[PDB]
Design an enzyme around this catalytic site. Structure first.
Site, PDB file in Angstrom:
ATOM      1  N   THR A   1      38.533 -30.646 -15.773  1.00  0.00           N
ATOM      2  CA  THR A   1      38.386 -29.237 -16.138  1.00  0.00           C
ATOM      3  C   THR A   1      37.911 -28.366 -15.020  1.00  0.00           C
ATOM      4  OG1 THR A   1      36.102 -29.499 -16.904  1.00  0.00           O
ATOM      5  CG2 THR A   1      37.846 -29.939 -18.548  1.00  0.00           C
ATOM      6  N   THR A   2      37.737 -28.975 -13.824  1.00  0.00           N
ATOM      7  CA  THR A   2      37.576 -28.162 -12.601  1.00  0.00           C
ATOM      8  C   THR A   2      38.693 -28.489 -11.636  1.00  0.00           C
ATOM      9  OG1 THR A   2      36.114 -29.934 -11.752  1.00  0.00           O
ATOM     10  CG2 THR A   2      35.097 -28.046 -12.779  1.00  0.00           C
TER      11      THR A   2
ATOM     12  N   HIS B   1      29.810 -34.730 -19.670  1.00  0.00           N
ATOM     13  CA  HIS B   1      31.024 -35.487 -19.271  1.00  0.00           C
ATOM     14  C   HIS B   1      30.613 -36.679 -18.483  1.00  0.00           C
ATOM     15  CE1 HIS B   1      33.687 -31.687 -19.583  1.00  0.00           C
ATOM     16  NE2 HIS B   1      33.391 -32.248 -20.779  1.00  0.00           N
TER      17      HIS B   1
ATOM     18  N   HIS C   1      28.489 -29.065 -18.504  1.00  0.00           N
ATOM     19  CA  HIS C   1      28.880 -27.677 -18.455  1.00  0.00           C
ATOM     20  C   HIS C   1      28.031 -26.938 -19.501  1.00  0.00           C
ATOM     21  CE1 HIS C   1      32.722 -28.791 -16.384  1.00  0.00           C
ATOM     22  NE2 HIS C   1      32.521 -29.954 -17.018  1.00  0.00           N
TER      23      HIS C   1
ATOM     24  N   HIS D   1      28.018 -35.260 -15.521  1.00  0.00           N
ATOM     25  CA  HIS D   1      27.601 -33.878 -15.303  1.00  0.00           C
ATOM     26  C   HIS D   1      27.678 -33.175 -16.646  1.00  0.00           C
ATOM     27  CE1 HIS D   1      31.954 -33.947 -14.952  1.00  0.00           C
ATOM     28  NE2 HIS D   1      31.876 -32.751 -15.555  1.00  0.00           N
TER      29      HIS D   1
ATOM     30  N   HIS E   1      28.703 -26.131  -8.392  1.00  0.00           N
ATOM     31  CA  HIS E   1      29.400 -25.821  -9.695  1.00  0.00           C
ATOM     32  C   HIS E   1      28.686 -26.432 -10.852  1.00  0.00           C
ATOM     33  CE1 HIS E   1      32.399 -28.758  -7.955  1.00  0.00           C
ATOM     34  NE2 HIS E   1      32.424 -29.362  -9.140  1.00  0.00           N
TER      35      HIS E   1
ATOM     36  N   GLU F   1      33.054 -26.865 -23.271  1.00  0.00           N
ATOM     37  CA  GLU F   1      34.498 -26.732 -22.811  1.00  0.00           C
ATOM     38  C   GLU F   1      35.419 -27.042 -23.978  1.00  0.00           C
ATOM     39  OE1 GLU F   1      34.728 -28.820 -18.990  1.00  0.00           O
ATOM     40  OE2 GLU F   1      34.589 -26.789 -18.216  1.00  0.00           O
TER      41      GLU F   1
HETATM   42  O1  LIG Z   1      34.365 -31.195 -14.540  1.00  0.00           O
HETATM   43  N1  LIG Z   1      34.716 -32.357 -13.995  1.00  0.00           N
HETATM   44  C1  LIG Z   1      34.501 -32.581 -12.654  1.00  0.00           C
HETATM   45  C2  LIG Z   1      34.864 -33.791 -12.088  1.00  0.00           C
HETATM   46  C3  LIG Z   1      35.433 -34.754 -12.853  1.00  0.00           C
HETATM   47  C4  LIG Z   1      35.643 -34.535 -14.161  1.00  0.00           C
HETATM   48  C5  LIG Z   1      35.270 -33.296 -14.741  1.00  0.00           C
HETATM   49  S1  LIG Z   1      35.539 -33.015 -16.426  1.00  0.00           S
HETATM   50 ZN   LIG Z   2      33.299 -31.797 -16.651  1.00  0.00          ZN
END
Ligand SMILES: O[n+]1ccccc1S
Ligand SMILES: [Zn+2]
Length: 257
Positions: free
Chosen positions: A195-196, A116, A93, A91, A61, A103
């Site tokens: 957000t996932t 993030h 997006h 990570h 992802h 996002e």
């Molecule tokens: O996208 N996301 C994945 C895991 C933890 C936090 C977030 S924002």
């Molecule tokens: Zn994220």
């Protein structure tokens, strides 16, 4: 299983994760005229000088840069937070095009990508426990716009060839996340969620007002990653962003005027 296509994308997630239509989902649009300055908010304290990165993983992802979080080495505190939150991973997006990918949005503006930095509250002992608590995580969100290269991002971009497909990892030691931060730590903050999936409502969001600039070549290399596993039809890893969710009964506070 969930993802970001026509058939398994954000509008589908509620069927396996009903919290997707909950009361404190993320992301949200940041309406800069409605956010209230809160002069009782503290400066954020980002203490990353002892950060120990270990590995980078394509999880199908996104990619996660993982840290040793077995001790207080890279922590976030202050700001809207009580207590100490340990960095576990970062990570991004991002979009298929420079006009989309973030996002959160700012007065409906989409940035090319969003970073993030995920931290968990040390009062809960472990990340898995922390995500069960309404104050378990603190996510520092930073927007990316396309312009000048970000020199501190280039070690990430150059390892991406080695984790092209889902489930690949690579050693990624000695990476300094301070090189991903903008000059200013002025922020917006609100209560929300990952957000996932599983979209848990455990996140204090802290979104920096100042983006960082990355180059077109840097974000092009993000777009060459794959959602699929090796030996599977190629599906480029792009548009791995959830759109803005209803704000409901929440207020976004600003640390600045
Ligand atoms: O996208 N996301 C994945 C895991 C933890 C936090 C977030 S924002
Ligand atoms: Zn994220």
């Amino acid at each position: 299983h969930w993802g970001y296509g026509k058939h398994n994308g954000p509008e589908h997630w509620h069927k396996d994760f009903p919290i997707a239509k909950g009361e404190r989902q993320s992301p949200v649009d940041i309406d800069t005229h409605t956010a209230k300055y809160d002069p009782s908010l503290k400066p954020l304290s980002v203490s990353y000088d002892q950060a120990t990165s270990l590995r980078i993983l394509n999880n199908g992802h996104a990619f996660n840069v993982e840290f040793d979080d077995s001790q207080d080495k890279a922590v976030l505190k202050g700001g809207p937070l009580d207590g100490t939150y340990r960095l576990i991973q970062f990570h991004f997006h991002w979009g298929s095009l420079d006009g989309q990918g973030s996002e959160h949005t700012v007065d409906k503006k989409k940035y090319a990508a969003e970073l993030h930095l995920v931290h968990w509250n040390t009062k809960y002992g472990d990340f898995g426990k922390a995500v069960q608590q309404p104050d378990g995580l603190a996510v520092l969100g930073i927007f990316l716009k396309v312009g000048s290269a970000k020199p501190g991002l280039q070690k990430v971009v150059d390892v991406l060839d080695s984790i092209k497909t889902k489930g690949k990892s690579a050693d990624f030691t000695n990476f300094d996340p301070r090189g991903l931060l903008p000059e200013s730590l002025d922020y917006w903050t609100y209560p929300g969620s990952g957000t996932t999936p599983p979209l848990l409502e455990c996140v204090t969001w802290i979104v920096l007002k100042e983006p960082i600039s990355v180059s077109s070549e840097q974000v092009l290399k993000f777009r060459k990653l794959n959602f699929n596993g090796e030996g599977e039809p190629e599906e480029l890893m792009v548009d791995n962003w959830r759109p803005a969710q209803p704000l409901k009964n929440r207020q976004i506070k600003a640390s600045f005027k």
